[PDB]
Design a protein around this ligand. Structure first.
Ligand SMILES: CC(C)(COP(=O)(O)OP(=O)(O)OC[C@H]1O[C@@H](n2cnc3c(N)ncnc32)[C@H](O)[C@@H]1OP(=O)(O)O)[C@@H](O)C(=O)NCCC(=O)NCCSC(=O)C1=CCCC=C1
Ligand SMILES: Nc1nc2c(c(=O)[nH]1)N[C@H]1C(S)=C(S)[C@@H](COP(=O)(O)O)O[C@H]1N2
Ligand SMILES: Nc1nc2c(c(=O)[nH]1)N[C@H]1C(S)=C(S)[C@@H](COP(=O)(O)O)O[C@H]1N2
Ligand code: SF4
Ligand code: SF4
Ligand code: SF4
Ligand code: SF4
Ligand code: SF4
Ligand code: SF4
Ligand code: SF4
Ligand SMILES: [Mg+2]
Ligand SMILES: [W+6]
Lengths: 169, 652, 161
């Protein structure tokens, strides 16, 4: 057996405040809480009051390429955005990529912290994290954000210009 | 290597607990195609007449049609077969949805159950893995409810489940088997499942399923889809809106129920209400339905979306299609709201929505005249609607009078006596018919009522129009593109047929024309029920996309066996004649082939005799209804004739 | 510079849950084409739960080599969807968009080379359509962020790989 963690998002309780984006990015500032910047949040709220759409989306896995076709839903009379539910750190869009460098971002459930802070700061309780045991093994190729980051750069700029500047700094 | 069919069956003994995969005979496929056809062959030579319905040796069979699991549109039907506890004849029964395809992707053509489990269990199939799981925690749980609990239990969100409710667990004679928005409803197959201690059958499938001539095959499918588009842009002119298009009767989409409520009888098939369909009622019922219908949904691989999820306040969601929408409403002399509500309970319990309503209306007519007393209904509530709820629960648990009522109108009457027999006026072969009591004898329907092995008028009709057009112009418009007719003569018949006059019923069409029409209409059902094709795109509606001329092409490209129009006709004849032999071996004789005495106000003794006489000869049967030696022989059914001679069924 | 972006428009309100799309996508991608079919192999997979009124066609997206640290799970407009219910990923956490025999990943290529997406073509109620539109240094900054969060020694050592 092994534990699986779930982010339970009641989009029907979300009020669109984006407090979640405020605290996530603030925690991930260096040093922690020294600045904040919703663009750096690993949780980003799809927010359109005119369509009554309030959907908190969490930074998922990294992809180096776009999909051949993008998807776009109508569900229960709501016309959602292109790729509106995708969690990918993807080259097609700014979400879950650092605004000033394009570095892939990933939610890690505030690892090393007592609890997810977005959950903590969401006072109406739209957010929660629970866990359960499952039988299926973790066949994941676990890989540090450190090497995910650099790998996206080598990908984007070639292993030449990257090696050039690392020693250079 | 086999195509279209998987080529294997699962043989399961519920007594021993044994499960075995068996290769099938590729000749039985050439001869009998699959589905109903192969089901019958197995019944014929494994269930002799000495066997009771609740004998351990009764077989309960689940079959995917031969083309289920292929890309053919609407081809998704499960055929369940057994000996009916109610009719004591063969009961075959069809269920749509997604189960039959899933069984084929799992790798199997059929599951043959024998024996009885002493404890309640269910069968679990995941590709090559097959086991018997304990089911005692699911005791008495509704059929749909049971399916959801099982899927969580096993963590198989995409498994398909066929289950019985409490009705079946108590061996109610009209207990059904339910799967999502699909039901094997009639003849008590649900009771035989329950008698065997089998609570459900869960299947999951992720194997491939091949066809013989790929490009040729997908070509025919595209041709079918193109025809479906055409046909929906072109409904049959001047025809009841539910029967003008493709699909099962489109009663979830269409709110116009004038036809039904004014021509079919209410109560215990007892009352016509010729002026029932008022503007007031039309709006009330539309309001109710608009609010109830959550979504129109399809069976596997079909765009016709005939069924609907139904949500009534404070009641779990359930799914519905076709005439069950009105049977409880009309039996109880009530409104659409009441029908939808009680139908939810009766679907969970798992009850035949054709037989149940009449059984209950039956019972209350007996209370009325006094043949039953108030004492037989301890705690009988006051209100009319409450009373149907009260009786439904008693039947499903076989509580007091429910134990009697749960055997159907035929057996209940003969148990109650005192004249109850007079009130079981709507049976053929101990099976309730649709609540229709018309005026003028219809010679086409006369033959279908008498001879249909499903004993249900709605599953033998379809290919030929129910009424004639007044104007010649209209008839010529209709035959014009009628490509489905096996032969040009069916156009000529429909051209000559008129509503009134010399060429009107019951004297026209002629006796021989009627025999030809009924033969054609029935042949297409038997082909559908072997292939696994939904009748909604075939035998049931006018001008279907599947028909006698392209069906052989489908079978040839699909299963890789030679097939043309004539050989397909002869195949369908072969196992329709086999089903016949079965019911003959179980004692069925010409005497049993009679509609209810009051089924038409105007009868013609001499005309009826010539009809049935002539139909038998067309069938190549006796004047007693038994297939003859020479017919059995031509059909490849030598072993049938020889057995008939040894039993003295046929003199040598 | 203007390149082309293709969008699969999915009107889930029109979906009847028939899974014809799964039938034809898998069939077309058999070898040879149409020689067989099998919904497990389809690059379009339908989330179908009649009892929740959920019918959501889902297309094969990008490959990912590992699962998320947290799986998301939405309640939206009263409907409680599945964990990872909208994800396109060919992912180790589940069977979707992977061959049921070899576990290898599947991608929708919009039936590249064909006249028309087959799933679209067989969806007679027209819940599916595909449409087109034209669309129109940081490296340095990124590399700092890395040094400043994981240290200059770490960044260096990793460059050699
Ligand atoms: C029921 C039906 C409307 C016939 O109703 P009609 O009113 O036309 O026929 P009628 O009542 O016989 O006659 C009325 C008057 O005409 C008179 N008369 C007659 N002929 C005459 C002549 N030649 N000349 C002169 N007069 C002639 C009669 O004497 C009578 O006069 P009266 O009042 O003074 O006594 C039509 O659908 C039908 O015939 N179906 C056939 C089979 C059937 O039962 N189909 C349904 C099966 S289930 C199904 O399919 C489903 C589907 C979906 C879900 C669930 C189920
Ligand atoms: N092959 C075949 N398809 C059939 C039928 C049949 O008898 N045989 N009955 C039709 C009718 S009248 C109805 S109402 C639906 C019922 O679908 P279900 O058995 O899944 O409840 O099946 C339709 N498709
Ligand atoms: N419980 C239940 N009974 C039902 C139905 C149903 O959908 N659910 N369908 C009715 C209709 S319209 C038909 S055509 C037949 C189909 O008979 P079968 O399921 O035995 O093939 O069952 C009738 N009884
Ligand atoms: S803090 Fe809660 S209510 Fe506010 S936007 Fe974030 S998830 Fe929604
Ligand atoms: S955002 Fe997600 S769904 Fe859209 S192109 Fe990128 S990976 Fe595909
Ligand atoms: S759990 Fe932590 S890392 Fe993930 S989005 Fe919430 S605040 Fe950010
Ligand atoms: S025509 Fe109707 S009943 Fe038949 S397969 Fe299609 S949706 Fe199902
Ligand atoms: S073919 Fe259309 S209606 Fe059917 S499941 Fe696919 S998208 Fe939905
Ligand atoms: S399926 Fe998608 S959301 Fe779920 S764990 Fe995998 S990548 Fe993350
Ligand atoms: S567009 Fe083509 S590849 Fe993509 S899901 Fe549809 S049939 Fe499959
Ligand atoms: Mg049925
Ligand atoms: W029906």
């Amino acid at each position: 057996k092994r534990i699986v963690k779930t982010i339970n998002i009641d989009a029907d309780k979300c009020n669109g405040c984006r407090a979640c984006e405020v605290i996530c990015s603030a925690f991930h500032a260096m040093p922690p809480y020294s600045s904040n910047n919703p663009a750096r949040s690993r949780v980003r709220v799809v927010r359109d009051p005119l369509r009554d759409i309030y959907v908190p989306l969490y930074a998922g896995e990294y992809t180096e390429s776009e999909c051949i076709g993008r998807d776009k839903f109508i569900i229960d009379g709501k016309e959602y955005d292109e790729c509106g539910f995708c969690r990918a750190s993807c080259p097609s869009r700014d979400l879950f990529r650092e605004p000033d460098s394009g570095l892939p971002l990933k939610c890690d459930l505030c690892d090393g912290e007592p609890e997810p802070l977005c959950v903590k700061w969401c006072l109406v309780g739209a957010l929660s994290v629970t866990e359960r045991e499952v039988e299926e093994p973790d066949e994941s190729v676990k890989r540090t954000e450190m090497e995910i980051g650099l790998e996206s750069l080598i990908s984007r700029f070639g292993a030449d210009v990257v090696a050039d500047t690392v020693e250079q700094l | 290597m086999r195509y279209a069919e998987t080529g294997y069956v699962l043989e399961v003994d519920l007594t021993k607990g044994s499960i075995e995969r068996v290769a099938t005979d590729p000749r039985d496929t050439e001869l009998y195609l699959g589905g109903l056809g192969t089901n019958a062959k197995i019944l014929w030579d494994r269930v002799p007449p000495e066997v009771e319905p609740f004998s351990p040796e009764n077989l309960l069979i689940f079959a995917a049609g031969l083309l289920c699991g292929t890309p053919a549109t609407g081809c998704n039907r499960t055929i369940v077969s057994t000996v009916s506890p109610q009719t004591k004849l063969m009961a075959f029964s069809m269920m749509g949805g997604f189960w039959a395809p899933e069984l084929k992707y799992a790798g199997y053509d059929k599951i043959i159950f024998r024996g009885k489990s002493p404890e309640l269990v269910y069968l679990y199939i995941n590709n090559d893995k097959v086991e018997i799981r304990d089911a005692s925690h699911l005791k008495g749980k509704g059929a749909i409810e049971t399916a959801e609990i099982i899927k969580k239990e096993l963590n198989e969100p995409r498994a398909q489940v066929a289950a019985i409710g409490k009705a079946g667990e108590n061996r109610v004679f009209y207990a059904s088997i339910e799967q999502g928005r699909s039901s094997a409803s009639r003849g008590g197959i649900g009771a035989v499942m329950g008698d065997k201690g089998l609570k459900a059958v869960v299947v999951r499938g992720t194997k491939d399923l091949c066809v013989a001539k790929p490009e040729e095959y997908i070509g025919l499918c595209n041709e079918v889809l193109d025809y479906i588009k055409h046909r929906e842009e072109n409904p049959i002119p001047d025809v009841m809106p539910i029967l003008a298009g493709l699909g099962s009767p489109q009663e979830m989409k269409v709110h116009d129920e004038k036809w039904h409520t004014e021509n079919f009888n209410w109560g215990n098939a007892r009352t016509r209400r010729k002026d029932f369909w008022t503007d007031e009622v039309s709006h009330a019922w539309e309001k109710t339905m608009d609010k109830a219908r959550t979504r129109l949904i399809s069976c596997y691989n079909c765009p016709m979306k005939c069924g609907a999820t139904i949500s009534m306040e404070g009641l779990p969601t359930y799914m519905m299609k076709c005439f069950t929408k009105l049977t409880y409403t009309m039996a109880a002399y009530s409104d659409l709201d009441f029908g939808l509500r009680i139908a939810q309970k009766a679907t969970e319990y798992g009850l035949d929505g054709f037989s149940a309503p009449q059984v209950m209306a039956f019972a209350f007519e007996l209370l009325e005249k006094g043949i039953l007393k108030d004492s037989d209904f301890p705690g009988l509530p006051e209100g009319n609607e409450e009373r149907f709820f009260y009786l439904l629960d008693k039947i499903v648990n076989r509580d007091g009078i429910g134990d009697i009522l749960a055997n159907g109108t035929y057996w209940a009457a003969q148990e109650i006596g005192n004249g109850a027999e007079d009130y079981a006026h709507n049976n053929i072969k101990k099976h309730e018919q649709l609540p229709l009591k018309l005026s003028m004898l219809n010679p086409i329907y006369y033959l279908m009522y008498c001879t249909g092995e499903k004993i249900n008028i709605t599953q033998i009709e379809g290919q030929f129009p129910q009424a004639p057009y007044p104007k010649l112009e209209q008839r010529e418009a209709f035959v014009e593109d009628w490509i489905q007719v096996p032969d040009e003569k069916f156009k000529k018949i429909f051209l000559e047929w008129e509503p009134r006059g010399e060429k009107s019923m019951p004297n026209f069409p002629t006796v021989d024309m009627c025999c030809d029409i009924v033969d054609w209409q029935e042949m297409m059902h038997y082909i559908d029920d072997a292939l696994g094709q939904c009748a909604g795109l075939s035998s049931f509606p006018l001008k279907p996309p599947y028909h006698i001329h392209n069906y052989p092409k489908f079978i040839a490209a699909g299963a890789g066996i030679e097939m043309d129009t004539e050989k397909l006709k002869k195949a369908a004849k072969r196992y329709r004649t086999l089903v016949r032999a079965f019911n003959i071996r179980r004692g069925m004789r010409r005497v049993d082939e009679q509609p209810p005495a009051n089924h038409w106000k105007n009868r013609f003794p001499e005309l009826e005799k010539e009809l049935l006489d002539s139909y038998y000869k067309l069938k190549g049967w006796n004047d007693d209804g038994i297939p003859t030696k020479e017919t059995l022989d031509d059909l490849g059914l030598g072993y049938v004739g020889d057995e008939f001679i040894k039993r003295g069924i046929l003199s040598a």
